[PDB]
Design a protein around this ligand. Structure first.
Ligand SMILES: Nc1ncnc2c1ncn2[C@@H]1O[C@H](COP(=O)(O)OP(=O)(O)OP(=O)(O)O)[C@@H](O)[C@H]1O
Ligand SMILES: Nc1ncnc2c1ncn2[C@@H]1O[C@H](COP(=O)(O)OP(=O)(O)OP(=O)(O)O)[C@@H](O)[C@H]1O
Ligand SMILES: [Mg+2]
Ligand SMILES: [Mg+2]
Lengths: 247, 247
């Protein structure tokens, strides 16, 4: 309910990192992950998981969509692949089926967060992903991985940082240039820049920013060190590109 | 809270069918299902699912066990295999990760049943299995597939029938003979007959019977027609063997 100190000079209290499916899945084989990419990412996420032990979730994109029962199985498989890889390197990773613990009411996800808190409360790493969710009149919908950070909003106290890793440096305006900053209260310019994919990321991150989260769209790379994600924005290395979305 | 009419001449209101892993998994390859067996069972379960649409759960045994994060993935895979097969023949089957929707409090599972009811409420078939569950002090335990019917007890109104299909005709007393009936209020003779596997089934089914369920241990066979499971016990075909556990 209360006043949370926020700013570019403050350390985040919780990290939700979303890795886009385009970064670890082969076009050259649809349905197929690139094990090298998953392995190298996993190593960089493990470092973050150890610093943010009990204060981080990993959200995977990817996994091919009542025929949406298939979707829940496809996204479970992706969670399993990340969780397995992470555990192979010493990280206590537990995959959770969002469909079993979250429904939609008037379009807003309602997480029954007891298990998620349990995994966190005792210092493990929840591995999440998009899913098929039921709503209040009992219908099933496809809920994108990009929107999964929204589920954390009621639960996370303090400063939530959401990072969505994708295959572009940020929101580009045309093209010549990226938008370094978006005010979630008036994000017209950002929507106007889009050519849906990036639209879904933007809606999701504006929603989270309205509830106080510091959000980023930036480029992921399996090899890239991500430790700066634990640090105040003001202390980030020079020449990191991102679109930062805050209120 | 109220008086439920029960008896050998009454039709069940809800079916929980548990299929033992020994019935559809190869010894000759551990971790490996027998697709023929799953296919033929699925056909017999589909018939029941259509009659008990919205009034049945399928519980799978099988799937090899913080290293119990592996267990939740192993049992998810088994659920997926059943769900996929069932959907291939017209049944609206949705697999649910028990670990995401159920914790232990003082050893008793506490199901957050909203999603399970949603899958049921709108006439689909939940596919369940054993799992790793967290408890109230946040520890993870292996929760056998045999105990999964216990999770339904608070939720199911009316007459619950639990059927556990295994590789024996019932509880054999030595050996020459099976116990056709066990009174759950005084099941000494049944425990005394056991030589744990069958012990876990018996504890689980005595617990459910104490809460009014009509429970059975009987032999499963991929080919066997199971329609009599929709019918009052008194009308079952002659020479069906089972151990029936009631209060
Ligand atoms: N203004 C814009 N700036 C940057 N990208 C944009 C813009 N408008 C549209 N896009 C598109 O959005 C894409 C990024 O979103 P996309 O949904 O394709 O990938 P991803 O979500 O990271 O991976 P996944 O969808 O597999 O989880 C870019 O590759 C780009 O083609
Ligand atoms: N009195 C008894 N009557 C019958 N079976 C008994 C008795 N005592 C012990 N058992 C053993 O219990 C076994 C059945 O339980 P078991 O756990 O092995 O299989 P299942 O549970 O159906 O398959 P899964 O364990 O793969 O889910 C029998 O095969 C038998 O060896
Ligand atoms: Mg996308
Ligand atoms: Mg057993």
């Amino acid at each position: 309910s209360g006043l949370v100190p926020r700013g570019s000079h403050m350390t985040p209290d919780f990290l939700a990192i979303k890795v886009g499916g385009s970064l670890f899945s082969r076009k050259d084989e649809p349905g197929s992950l690139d094990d090298d990419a998953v392995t190298r990412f996993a190593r960089n996420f493990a470092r973050l998981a150890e610093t943010y032990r009990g204060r981080m979730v990993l959200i995977s994109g990817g996994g091919a969509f009542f025929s949406l029962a298939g979707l829940t199985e496809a996204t479970f498989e992706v969670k399993k692949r990340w969780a397995e890889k992470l555990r192979g390197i010493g990280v206590d990773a537990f995959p959770l089926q969002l469909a079993a613990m979250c429904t939609l009411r008037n379009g807003i996800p309602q997480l029954r967060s007891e298990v998620l808190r349990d995994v966190l409360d005792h210092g493990a790493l929840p591995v999440l992903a998009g899913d098929a969710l039921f709503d209040e009149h009992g219908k099933l919908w496809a809920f994108s991985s990009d929107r999964v950070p929204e589920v954390l909003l009621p639960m996370v106290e303090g400063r939530l940082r959401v990072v969505t890793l994708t295959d572009v440096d940020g929101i580009v305006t045309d093209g010549d240039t990226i938008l370094p900053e978006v005010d979630a209260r008036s994000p017209e310019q950002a929507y106007a820049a889009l050519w849906g994919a990036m639209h879904t990321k933007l809606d999701a991150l504006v929603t989270c920013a309205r509830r106080g989260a510091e959000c980023f769209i930036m480029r992921g790379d399996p090899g890239s060190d991500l430790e700066f994600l634990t640090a105040p924005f003001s202390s980030w290395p020079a020449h990191v590109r991102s679109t930062r979305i805050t209120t």
